[PDB]
Amino acid sequence: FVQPAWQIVLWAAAYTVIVVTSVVGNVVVMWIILAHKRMRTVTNYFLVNLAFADASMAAFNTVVNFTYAVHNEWYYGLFYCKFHNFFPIAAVFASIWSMTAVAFDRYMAIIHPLQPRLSATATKVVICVIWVLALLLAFPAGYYSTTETMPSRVVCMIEWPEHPNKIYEKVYHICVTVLIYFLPLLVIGYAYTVVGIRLWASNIFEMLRIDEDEAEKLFNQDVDAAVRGILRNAKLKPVYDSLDAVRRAALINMVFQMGETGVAGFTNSLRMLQQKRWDEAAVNLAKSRWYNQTPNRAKRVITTFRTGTWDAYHEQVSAKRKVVKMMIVVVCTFAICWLPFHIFFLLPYINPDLYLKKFIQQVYLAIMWLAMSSTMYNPIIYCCLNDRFRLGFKHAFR
Ligand SMILES: C[C@@H](O[C@H]1OCCN(Cc2nc(=O)[nH][nH]2)[C@H]1c1ccc(F)cc1)c1cc(C(F)(F)F)cc(C(F)(F)F)c1
DSSP, X not given: OOOOHHHHHHHHHHHHHHHHHHHHHHHHHHHHXXXXXXXXXXXXXXXXXXXXXXXXXXXXXXHHHHXXXXXXXXXXXXXXXXXXXXXXXXXXXXXXHHHHHHHHHHHHHHTOOSSOOOOHHHHXXXXXXXXXXXXXXXXXXXXXXEEEEOSSOEEXXXXXXXXXXXXXXXXXXXXXXXXXXXXXXXXXXXXXXXXXXXHHOOOHHHHHHXXXXXXXXXXXXXXXXHHHHHTTOTTTXXXXXXXXXXXXXXXXXXXXXXXXXXHTTOHHHHHHHHTTOHHHHHHHHTXXXXXXXXXXXXXXXXXXXXXXXXXXXXXXXXXXXXXXXXXXXXXXXXXXXXXXXXXXXXXXXXXXXXXXXXXXXXXXXXXXXXHXXXXXXXXXXXXXXXXXXXXXXXXXXX
C-alpha cells in the first residue's frame, strides 16, 4: 500500500544510472577490442559478445520494465509486450554462455596446450550458435505474451494454452532457470577451480623435480620415507608438526639435499620457524655454508619458509593469472545479481499466498534493480583489475 512520490522519483534516478553506465561502459569495451584489433584475442572476441548483450538488454528493457512496475499499466502495445518478455531471456543466455566460452578457452590453454581448440573462424560460429540457441529458448515466452484491454487500463500478461494442470509453463520456466543460471555456473565453477589450482598451487614432487642420457628420479618412495624419518628424529619432529603444508615441503627439500643429521644442525633457524618468526629465520639461513655453496636453491627454500607459498616455483610476471582473477570476479558478480531474481519467481511454487501479500512492489523493485545492474559492473571490473583496459578507457577521454 506504500505509494509515495518522493520514492518514485528516487527509484527512476537509481534505474537511469543503470542505463547510462551500461551503454557508455560496454560500448567503450566493445570499441577497445574490435578496433585497434591488435588486441583481438579469442577471450576478448567473446567478451565483445557479452558487452553487446549487456548494453542491449539495458537499452530495451530497463525503461519498459520500470514503468510497468511503478504504474501497473502497459503503454507500449502488443508488439513491445511480446518483445519485452522475449529479449531478456535471449540476452541473459548469450551473456552467461559467452562467459562459459571464455572459461572453456582458458581451461584448454592452461590444462591442454598440445591440443589447440582456438580458431578465428570458429569463434564467430560459436557466437553464432550461442545466439541461435538464445532466441529459440526465449521464443515461447514471447509467443504467449498478450495485452488484455480493460475499462481503466491496458495490461501485458503471458497466457499459455489451457492444460489440465498447465505443467508446460512451469517446466519451461524451470528449464530456462537451469540453462540461464544453475547449469553454466556449475560448468564455469569447475573450469576455473581446476585452472585456479594449476596456476597458483604446487606440491613436493613438483618442487623436488625442479630443485633435483640419464635415468628417472624415484621421489614417490623417498618422500614417504623422509616423512617417516623426520617424525622419528627428536630435534626435527616438533618443528615439522608446527609447520603448514607449504613450509613442511621446504623442510623436506633440505633433508633431500643435506640429510636428516645435517638439517638437525640448524638448531636456531629451526627454533625460529617453530616460534613462527619467518623473516628472522629467512635472514639466518642466508648466512649458512648451505647458502654460500648453492645460493639459487637455498634462495627458493628460504623464500618458501618466509612466504608460505609456491611463488618461488611459478613465473613472476604472469599474464595468465591476471585474466583468470578478472573472469572469476565477473562470474561471482553475475551469480550474486541473479540469485534474488530467480528465488523471487521460484517462490509461487512453494507458497502462492506469500507473494500476493504486504508491499511486494517495493521488494520487486529492489530485486529487479540488482538483476539489471549486472549489465553495468563488467567495464568497471576490467578497469579496476586489467592494465590495458584501464589505459584504453583513459585514451577515451576528451
Ligand atoms: C521476461 C522476464 O520473464 C519473467 O517475467 C515474466 C514471467 N516469467 C515467468 C514465465 N512464465 C512464462 O510462461 N514464461 N516466463 C519470468 C521469468 C522467466 C524466466 C526466468 F528464468 C525467471 C523469471 C524476464 C526474464 C529474465 C531472465 F531471463 F533473466 F530470466 C530477466 C528479466 C528482467 F531482468 F528483464 F527483469 C525479465
